[PDB]
């Protein structure tokens, strides 16, 4: 039934996410000018752009995947990191949105630092450098699969989904998004999300215990490692709230 195919689909998704993975070592080993601090700056800007333009929620993580992959293969100058980020948003939007972001609007969002002709030429460079492996698995793919297995009210799945997408965006702004595969970012995001930001005593129909073990079983990890992931995500939240409020 749908159970036999859901097993197969999930097993297929876990194999697909190995093919579109960046290198955890590209700062040390490929980049000379681009530092981790600059990754966070360009990713923070990409995220604001995607949120301003009300992009589908996958555009921003998918663009970070393109960015980390291009940086695992090619040195990029500091002065062209923004151009790479705009191009990654450009291509991710085409993959995920009915009416993609326009070239002219992306250039406006760099304060006209880059020009449309440069965006189009960078798009050919990016797409060819990735050998057209553009259909990468996103954490959002795994979140929807996990949620289709959770016996919760739709009301509650909606909140869980919102929180988990917020958490996925947070991870994508940090070097965690580089080492951890999408399934693991998704699982940690979901178990963090069912904690509801510590606002209420969680009241879930599938216990947190049963969920974490279910999730660990299907993404093939130790439950200890899923809890370490969630803890990293909650530390990322704590840090970003402190950084945000101070200015």
């Amino acid at each position: 039934d749908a159970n036999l195919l859901n097993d197969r689909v999930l097993r297929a998704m876990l194999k697909a996410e190995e093919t579109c993975a960046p290198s955890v070592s590209y700062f040390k080993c490929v980049q000379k000018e681009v530092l981790p601090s600059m990754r966070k700056i360009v990713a923070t800007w990409m995220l604001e752009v995607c949120e301003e333009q009300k992009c589908e929620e996958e555009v921003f993580p998918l663009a970070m995947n393109y960015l980390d992959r291009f940086l695992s293969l090619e040195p990029v100058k500091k002065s062209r990191l923004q151009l790479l980020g705009a191009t990654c948003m450009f291509v991710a939007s085409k993959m995920k949105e009915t009416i993609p972001l326009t070239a002219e609007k992306l250039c406006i969002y760099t304060d006209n630092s880059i020009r449309p002709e440069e965006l189009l030429q960078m798009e050919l460079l990016l797409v060819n450098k990735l050998k057209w492996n553009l259909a990468a698995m996103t954490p959002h793919d795994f979140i929807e699969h996990f949620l289709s297995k959770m016996p919760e009210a739709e009301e509650n799945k909606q909140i869980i989904r919102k929180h988990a997408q917020t958490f996925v965006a947070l991870c994508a702004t940090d070097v965690k998004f580089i080492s951890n595969p999408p399934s693991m970012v998704a699982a940690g995001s979901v178990v963090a999300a069912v904690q509801g930001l510590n606002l209420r005593s969680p009241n879930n129909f599938l216990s947190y215990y049963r969920l974490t073990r279910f999730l660990s079983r299907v993404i093939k990890c130790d439950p200890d490692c899923l809890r370490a992931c969630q803890e990293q995500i909650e530390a990322l939240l704590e840090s970003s709230l402190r950084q945000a409020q101070q200015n």
Binding site: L4, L5, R8, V9, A12, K15, A16, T19, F90, V91, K94, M95, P100, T102, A103, P116, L119, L120, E123, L124, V127, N128, K131, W132, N133, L134, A135
Partner: protein, 260 residues
């Protein structure tokens, strides 16, 4: 442009070059181009043995996209015309059908509907491996719901599979029609006229377009096929697309269970 072919000296296998000349505009690569080529790249990662392998995507810049594919010289129509005068042995047919179904199940599991399955685009290597060919880019093999212009999804491929399945025994197609109305008439000649509450809504031709007709025994059109293979044929040649057997289910049918 013109399609080229070449042998690989790393092995002895063949390779071909297709190429599309894509419309370059002010928004760069077209949406359909990046999505469709990326879908082929994603499939390629699974390395499925029953689809032609994509070897490269060579784009040159207006913008031109050239794909390098695995090439299989012989299609199934040729494989069937070379068959011994008595026909292909039953075991050979079950083997071709298993591979055909695994390849199709692979595309369906990736939300690809082939839509134009015919013996001409099912390839057979000199080693006997079946490979599906021109996906993701004559009315004889067309599912009733497509001939009726209603909603269609992956079941339309399983209807085509039933036609080809029966064709491997007959060495001549099952339903040969001149138009949609004619193709349908020949179909109902065999499987019977579907009842009223089985007819789609907002369809091109009403049910009154067709005279009343009952099902003929399905082994009248494949008398050389064993009885359980005939049961399986009927489950593919099922009018309601929601009751039609899926590729994965057909692989669990006892008729296709290899012995030992």
């Amino acid at each position: 442009g013109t399609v080229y072919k070449a042998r690989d000296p790393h092995s002895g296998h063949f390779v071909a070059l297709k190429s599309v000349r894509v419309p370059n505009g002010e928004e760069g690569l077209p949406i359909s181009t990046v999505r469709e080529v990326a879908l082929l790249r994603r499939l390629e990662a699974f390395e499925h043995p029953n689809v032609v392998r994509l070897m490269d995507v060579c784009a040159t810049s207006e913008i031109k996209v050239t794909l390098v594919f695995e090439h299989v010289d012989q299609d199934l129509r040729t494989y069937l015309d070379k068959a011994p005068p008595p026909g292909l042995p039953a075991e050979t047919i079950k083997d071709l059908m298993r591979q055909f179904l695994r390849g199709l199940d692979f595309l369906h599991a990736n939300c690809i509907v082939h839509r134009d399955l015919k013996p001409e685009n099912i390839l057979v290597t000199s080693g006997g491996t079946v490979k599906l060919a021109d996906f993701g880019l004559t009315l004889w093999y067309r599912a009733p719901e497509v001939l009726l212009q209603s909603t269609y999804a992956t079941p339309v491929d399983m209807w085509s599979v039933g036609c080809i399945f029966a064709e491997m025994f007959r060495r001549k197609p099952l339903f040969c029609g001149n138009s949609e109305a004619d193709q349908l008439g020949k179909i109902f000649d065999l499987i019977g006229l579907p009842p009223e509450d089985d007819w789609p809504r907002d369809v091109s031709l009403p049910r009154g377009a067709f005279p009343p007709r009952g099902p003929r025994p399905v082994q009248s059109v494949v008398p050389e096929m064993e009885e359980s293979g005939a049961q399986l044929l009927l489950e593919m040649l099922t009018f309601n697309p929601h009751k039609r057997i899926s590729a994965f289910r057909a692989l669990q049918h006892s008729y296709l269970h290899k012995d030992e």
